[PDB]
Design a protein around this nucleic acid. Structure first.
Ligand SMILES: [Mg+2]
Ligand SMILES: [Mg+2]
Ligand SMILES: [Mg+2]
Ligand SMILES: [Mg+2]
Ligand SMILES: [Mg+2]
Ligand SMILES: [Mg+2]
Ligand SMILES: [Mg+2]
Ligand SMILES: [Mg+2]
Ligand SMILES: [Mg+2]
Ligand SMILES: [Mg+2]
Ligand SMILES: [Mg+2]
Ligand SMILES: [Mg+2]
Ligand SMILES: [Mg+2]
Ligand SMILES: [Mg+2]
Ligand SMILES: [Mg+2]
Ligand SMILES: [Mg+2]
Lengths: 65, 271, 100, 88, 70, 116
RNA sequence: GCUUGAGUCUCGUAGAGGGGGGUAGAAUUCCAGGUGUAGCGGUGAAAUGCGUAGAGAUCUGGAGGAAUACCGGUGGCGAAGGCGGCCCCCUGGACGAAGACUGACGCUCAGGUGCGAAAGCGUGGGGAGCAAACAGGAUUAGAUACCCUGGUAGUCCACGCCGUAAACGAUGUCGACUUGGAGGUUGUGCCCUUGAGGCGUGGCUUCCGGAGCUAACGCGUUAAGUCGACCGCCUGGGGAGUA
């Protein structure tokens, strides 16, 4: 649950998509922090990074484009 | 800016002036001036053909460069001047070889700025280049209608033309009236938007303020007699007629366009 | 002096046009005493959604340090270029050499 | 925001020591250097009603400091307002 | 909520997996929510009212944990 | 005619009706049948059974084209969201895949005002 | 004179704090077409409305305006009003650790000045959706309402005006003191981060309760407890926040 991003403290980067694809649903929606367990600080950086990879077409806005 | 004249007289109560301190205060450029005699509406036969014209102040025509067919040779703006023959201010322009010219002044042009024309020019206000090279969705002015003709559309104060789309050899423009019109793609178009955008907000305030621009009084057809105007007649403000022009044709609704030769270019009429 | 993270995508049919323009845009940074730190080129990628059709593009990453004004006349050449799509100029600092 | 290099000039120039920040002359000289730098921001962004509250606090705090300096001594106050250029 | 039917499969297995995908995506909740305009002052009140229930009802079962009923 | 082999079924489920349209993979419509036109006028066309009959009639009227595979593209809420797909299998078609298409704005236009 | 109030400087942290400019995707509506048939829409039920001039559905192309799903949280920022896509430019406040510096420079504040939701006003633009007024269809004893089909101002932008709200924790600002518990968010110090760890220390915030206070309900270290400084206001209901 709470584990990832708290050990090996790092700032969520929008470039690496493998880490980002873990935190989205089957339709490109960001997964709530209640489910994954990411801390409230790193969810804000995480969400802001997913909204940045979508702009560059690295990630889908929705599964129906 | 617009300044409201204080009511020191009935005729100054309602005046609103548009004053531009950036304008030239001295005399115009002598070599680019001409003689401009008036007519009063009268054609060859000496008979008035446009009514409500006559009188007014004397004006001298300034030869404004519309073609803008001097490619290369960057030009520096010398000063801004007041053109009485037009609704927008003009700009004196000095080219790097020594030739001076008059141009329609875009809305963001001050003395000292640099312009130039041709396919190599940059996308900046005041620059003229063929609409092949101008990005779609841009706002241009002084558009042409035929390659090399000189420039007819978007010429008054504050008017502009959007380039909606480009389809091969033609460009669709959303004219200021709401029309969508196709023009050739080699027609030049000065990039930017014409200046003097406050020209709307001026109010004359009195009858002489319109008389001294050459606008003679307009008489209504109801005050006429049944022989001078189809409305005419009456004993105490009677109308009972469908409103018409003084020559019988029905004003107030009836369309009059009939060309059939330039209908290929009108994509969508006004609204 | 300010640090930026320019990432721009070129047309899929200008893949031979990027390797010439990448140094031309870089030369403007170095001409004004601005340095460049990490210039990875991601090659040709696949878009998650179409961008005016074009299910493929060409990604570049510059990550330069330049005066605040120099990036201003680099943004416009991205804007008026018909072959550069979805330029994004962030404002990072420090780090380099990751993600590929 | 009165960057680090610019705030070190005023402290050294108006200070009685190399590291003497906080002296009434230095504090007023620092506040004036920001009120003057903000007159170009508010000539363009006239609608910044939120940043203007911060500006109107440095104005009202530099006047509170000038009053203290004048009451404490006048040989140092008259030199400071003349050196800076203010009180009209 | 796209669901692709695999190979060597029944149908009623697939249709049940379609509902599960749709229920997980909250499609019908979003459609029902966006039918009419909820005023901002009723959207904020409906959120604090439902969080007050979430807190009390969790503390209500705690006070009922340390009792014998018979 | 034209003997189309692969088609697409477009179920426009709603709170008040259900329109089933079978199109080819390029969007052209081959035939349609609704729930309210099936003799279910009134408060009976909302019911999921009335939408089942629509799937039966829309399975007909494309007999000539001879479709053998269908992709189901459900849209909107409503009772005829489930009972229509299964009637497109009980009618003899093959459901290659099922995709849910539905207009969900990212907070776009303002919806109508609340009913009282 | 002094540094325990107040403030300045060095280093970082978090944030829908503000103003300006661009850009992305989903969706509604409209326009031009292809396929395609007799219904669509709506309701408690209907009708008005749209459709054989071919609607509704479905696919392609385009133009426009507004708002930013998920993240999202009795979460955060702001003096209050309030602030939610992403990026850049200009900019205000807060907080924390270790130091250095000024040496009472402080608290409150009548008149005064400024900011102040929504509606509304003026000039010029814009206008997708929604929708006062308005029209029609129903319900009804009646229904100049709720319900349905449409729909103008307005909602949007620039600049001015208005200056009021159940503008509300119905609780003025500042300072000190007075048992506890479980949480949220944001810094920081020490040690076995040696392993999803342990102990302290600050800022802001939600809940429950002790003494006490209160007419009671209830507040309860963020007091409505115990005190000090300054300001605003109250003096039976109606007439009346009216002349
Ligand atoms: Mg007249
Ligand atoms: Mg007469
Ligand atoms: Mg006659
Ligand atoms: Mg009479
Ligand atoms: Mg009569
Ligand atoms: Mg409705
Ligand atoms: Mg005060
Ligand atoms: Mg007062
Ligand atoms: Mg308003
Ligand atoms: Mg208005
Ligand atoms: Mg108006
Ligand atoms: Mg009041
Ligand atoms: Mg409020
Ligand atoms: Mg009150
Ligand atoms: Mg309590
Ligand atoms: Mg009154």
């Amino acid at each position: 649950f709470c584990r990832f991003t708290a050990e090996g403290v790092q700032e969520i980067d929008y470039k690496d998509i493998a880490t980002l694809k873990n935190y989205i649903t089957e339709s490109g929606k960001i997964v709530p922090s209640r489910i994954t367990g990411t801390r409230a600080k790193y969810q804000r950086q995480l969400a802001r990074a997913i909204k940045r990879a979508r702009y560059l077409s690295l990630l889908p806005y929705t599964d129906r484009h | 800016a617009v300044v409201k004249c204080k009511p020191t007289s009935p005729g100054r109560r309602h005046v609103v002036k548009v004053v531009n301190p950036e304008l030239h205060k001295g005399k115009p450029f002598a070599p680019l001036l001409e003689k401009n005699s008036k007519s009063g509406g009268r054609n060859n036969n000496g008979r008035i053909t446009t009514r409500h014209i006559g009188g007014g102040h004397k004006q001298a025509y300034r030869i404004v460069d519309f073609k803008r067919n001097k490619d290369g040779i960057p030009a520096v703006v010398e000063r801004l001047e007041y053109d009485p023959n037009r609704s927008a201010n003009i700009a004196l322009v000095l080219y790097k070889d020594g030739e001076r010219r008059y141009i329609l002044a875009p809305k963001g042009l001050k003395a000292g700025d640099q312009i130039q024309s041709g396919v190599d020019a940059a996308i900046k206000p005041g620059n003229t280049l063929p609409m092949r090279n101008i990005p779609v969705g841009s706002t241009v002015h002084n558009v042409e209608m035929k390659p090399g003709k000189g420039g007819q559309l978007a010429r008054s104060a504050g008017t502009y033309v959007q380039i909606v789309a480009r389809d091969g050899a033609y460009v669709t423009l959303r004219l200021r009236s709401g029309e969508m019109r196709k023009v050739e793609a080699d027609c030049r178009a000065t990039l930017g938007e014409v200046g003097n955008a406050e020209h709307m907000l001026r109010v004359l305030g009195k009858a002489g303020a319109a008389r001294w621009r050459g606008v003679r009084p307009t008489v209504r057809g109801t005050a006429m007699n049944p022989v001078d105007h189809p409305h005419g007649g009456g004993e105490g403000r009677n109308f009972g007629k469908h409103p018409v022009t003084p020559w019988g044709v029905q004003t107030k609704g009836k369309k009059t366009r009939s060309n059939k030769r330039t209908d290929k270019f009108i994509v969508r009429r006004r609204s | 002096m300010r640090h930026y993270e320019i990432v721009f995508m070129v047309h899929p049919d200008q893949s031979e046009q990027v390797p010439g323009m990448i140094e031309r845009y870089t030369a403007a940074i170095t001409g004004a005493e601005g340095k460049i730190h990490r210039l990875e080129d991601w090659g040709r990628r696949q878009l998650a959604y179409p961008i005016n059709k074009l299910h493929k593009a060409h990604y570049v990453l510059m990550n330069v340090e330049a005066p605040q004004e120099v990036i201003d006349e680099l943004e416009t050449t991205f804007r008026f270029n018909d072959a550069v799509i979805r330029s994004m100029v962030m404002r990072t600092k420090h780090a380099v050499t990751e993600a590929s | 925001s009165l960057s680090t290099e610019a705030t070190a000039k005023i402290v050294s120039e108006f200070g009685r020591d190399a590291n003497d920040t906080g002296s009434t002359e230095v504090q007023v000289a620092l506040l004036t250097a920001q009120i003057n730098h903000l007159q170009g921001h508010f000539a363009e962004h006239k609608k910044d009603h939120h940043s203007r509250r911060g500006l109107l606090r440095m104005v009202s705090q530099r006047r509170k400091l000038l009053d203290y300096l004048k009451r404490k001594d006048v040989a140092r106050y008259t030199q400071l307002i003349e050196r800076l250029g203010l009180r009209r | 909520p796209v669901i692709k039917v695999r190979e060597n499969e029944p149908f009623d297995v697939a249709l049940r997996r379609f509902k599960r995908s749709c229920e997980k995506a909250g499609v019908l909740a979003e459609v029902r929510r966006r039918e009419f305009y909820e005023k901002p002052t009723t959207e904020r009140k409906r959120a604090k009212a439902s969080a007050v229930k979430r807190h009390a009802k969790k503390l209500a079962r705690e006070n009922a944990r340390r009792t014998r009923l018979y | 005619r034209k003997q189309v082999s692969d088609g697409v079924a477009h179920i426009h489920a709603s709170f008040n009706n259900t329109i089933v349209t079978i199109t080819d993979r390029q969007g052209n419509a081959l035939g349609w049948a609704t729930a309210g036109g099936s003799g279910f006028r009134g408060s009976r066309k909302s019911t999921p059974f009335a939408a089942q009959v629509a799937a039966e009639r829309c399975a007909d009227a494309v007999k000539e084209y001879g479709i053998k595979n269908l992709e189901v593209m459900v849209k909107g809420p409503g009772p005829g969201r489930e009972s229509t797909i299964r009637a497109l299998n009980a009618a003899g078609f093959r459901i290659t895949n099922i995709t849910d298409v539905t207009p969900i704005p990212h907070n776009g236009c303002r919806p109508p005002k609340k009913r009282r």
